[PDB]
Amino acid sequence: NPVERYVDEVLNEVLVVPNINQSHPTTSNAAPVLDAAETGHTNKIQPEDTIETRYVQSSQTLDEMSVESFLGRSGCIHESVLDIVDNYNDQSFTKWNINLQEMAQIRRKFEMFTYARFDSEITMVPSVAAKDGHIGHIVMQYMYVPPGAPIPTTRDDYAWQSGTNASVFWQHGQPFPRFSLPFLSIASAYYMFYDGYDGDTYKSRYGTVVTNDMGTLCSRIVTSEQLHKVKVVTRIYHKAKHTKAWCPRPPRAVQYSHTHTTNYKLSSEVHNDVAIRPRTNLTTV
Amino acid sequence: GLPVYVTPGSGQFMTTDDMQSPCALPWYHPTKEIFIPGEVKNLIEMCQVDTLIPINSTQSNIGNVSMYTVTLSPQTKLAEEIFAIKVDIASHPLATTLIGEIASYFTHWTGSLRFSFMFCGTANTTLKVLLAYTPPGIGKPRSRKEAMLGTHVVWDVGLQSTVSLVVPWISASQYRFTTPDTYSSAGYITCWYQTNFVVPPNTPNTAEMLCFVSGCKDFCLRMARDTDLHKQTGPITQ
């Protein structure tokens, strides 16, 4: 019943954990505690098998541990800066080659999977710093330039006409812009990792750069030059919606160094590069 | 609360919007409506009524009732021209007629026009006149023979004083601009002597004629606009 299901949604009780049943003393030639990890399987022994348990009714739910929940939180993926210093025409617009690899927090979470398919929700948080005192009337334009479309080279480039590309205009004072984006890949899922090249020569590129081109985000202050200089910083937040993930993998153990690559750097004292805290010895808790 | 998404256009004021708004005078009860003769529900009702064309509006006649009459008299040359005007509803001299004035509050027009003429000579004055409409794509006719090839009515003056000529809607496009536009100019109306103005002895040798215009059943105006036939060059004070 969709209504019962609805109640479960509201209470977050869609996925319930099993109860613990009462167990008793045993004397058997069936030893559940003994097994063989060589098989590559985890011994499914439960508490009732190794001790005498009481009956307990579980009320815990796994809803929050769902992939939708894990990746369904909006996090920052880019900080765009437009700092008017001495040349408005050159400093009033910029561009970014879109990717979800520049911020460690969300990157690490997505990378716990090999392939992921999801729709995106983008929320932008623009903040205008009044460097000289007033901010005037700031109107921003964020244009999505898919790979192939002409990238504007000046603040008045014809490409800004956005005759076909999707543009979002924001007026200072109005609520934060937000829009959704359908799964964009040309494949069935996004590659979080890609053990391949775009060719078979010594100079072929390796990794997700080959498969994950999302195009360019071009921004510009629509307002013409003003007396007082401003510094507009637009923070882009991304959230995954309607998510699916395949083949889980180990979490990133060392810091990230670059986008589209698993490369890392190690110091002379590697224990400083990982989160493992050295133990005094085996018996010191 | 109910999540909402404020759409572009919000908070703007468009003079042609159609929204509701709270009443400043709650509980107020309007005065009872009484029957008043003459209710008008659509401007077409006014476009279907004949009004006089200031056809003789030469600079010397303007400001005189004579700007509304055309004078006829015995001719010595046959088939002489009497008058000629454009059929365009908002062109001069049609502009200030009721239908021209109303058409000037709209951008597009369509339909057939009805031009009527009333002879004012004596009961003993006779005359036959040819009224013609020349569809566009050609200049105004230079002779009766040229005009006669288009739409026309041969009017014989007799007991019934008035005659009507209908200018059919003959256009490429379904509508035309009310404002003078080359592409949509509708043609001309010319009047010629078919025979001659004849009178017995001791009878005035000239007579007047009045000209009317109104719209036919198919007349229609579209796209409301402000008129250019009236202006305000200063404040209107008490």
Binding site: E9, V10, L11 | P3
Partner: peptide, 29 residues
């Protein structure tokens, strides 16, 4: 989230968000 009652005096106890914490003050007793 709509608890539609009828008596006509119809009640619409709408819950706009999907978490129980989001709803307003509780009913009494």
């Amino acid at each position: 989230g709509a608890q539609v009652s009828r008596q006509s005096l119809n009640y619409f106890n709408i819950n706009y968000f999907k978490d129980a914490a989001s709803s307003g003050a509780s009913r009494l007793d």
